[PDB]
């Protein structure tokens, strides 16, 4: 089953965190990251489409995240705002969808 995992689970301020993904399906159409506990257009950090190997940032984007090709995501120079939940939306090649949620905590 799709899964995410902050590391560190707790995150020093001005430093950085990585959200790992687990059970990423074999065959993908694309995938997306979202500030929140849910998939929401206006809260998208970034979308990666396989067909173009490209990453187009959404509205939520702080310009300090980096997505990688195994669906993992990295936020550098974390601020207090970055704390919270984060949600991964994944689209399979047959277009069946999948989400998983995760979370990290920043401290000053």
Partner 1 sequence: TAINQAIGNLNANTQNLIDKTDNSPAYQATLLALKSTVGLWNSIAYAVICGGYTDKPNHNTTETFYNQPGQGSDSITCGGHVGLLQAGKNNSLSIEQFATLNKAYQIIQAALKQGLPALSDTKKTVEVTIKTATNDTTVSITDTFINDAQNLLTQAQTIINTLQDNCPQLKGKSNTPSWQTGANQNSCSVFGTEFSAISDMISNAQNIVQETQQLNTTPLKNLNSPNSIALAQSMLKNAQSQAAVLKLANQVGSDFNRISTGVLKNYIEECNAVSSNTWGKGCAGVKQTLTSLENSNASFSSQTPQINQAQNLANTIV
Cα(103)–Cα(105) distance, rounded to whole angstroms? 7
Instruction: Return the number of the residue (57 or 83) whose C-beta is nearest partner 1.
Output: 57
Instruction: Kindly identify the residues of this chain, within the stretch 23-82, that bind partner 1 according to CB under 8 A.
Output: 27-30, 32, 39, 41-42, 44, 47-52, 56, 58-59
| Closest separation in Å from C-beta 73 to partner 1 | 15
87 binds partner 1 (CB under 8 A): no
Q: In this structure, is the dihedral angle defined by the CA atoms of residues 20, 87, 3 and 108, taken in order, positive or negative?
A: positive
Burial 37-67 (b: 16+ CB within 10 A, else e): eeeeeebbbbbbeeeeeebeebebeeeebeb
91 binds partner 1 (CB under 8 A): yes
Which member of 17, 88, 89, 106 binds partner 1 (CB under 8 A)?
89
């Amino acid at each position: 089953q799709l899964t995410t995992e902050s590391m560190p689970f707790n995150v020093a301020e001005g430093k950085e965190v990585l959200l790992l993904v687990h059970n990423l399906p074999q065959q993908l159409f694309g995938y997306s990251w979202y500030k929140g506990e849910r998939v929401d257009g206006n809260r998208q950090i970034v979308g990666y489409a396989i067909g173009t190997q490209q990453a187009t940032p959404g509205p939520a984007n702080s310009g300090r995240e980096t997505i990688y090709p195994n669906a993992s995501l990295l936020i550098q120079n974390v601020t207090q705002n970055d704390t919270g939940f984060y949600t991964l939306q994944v689209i399979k090649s047959d277009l069946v969808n999948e989400e998983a949620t995760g979370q990290f905590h920043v401290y000053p």
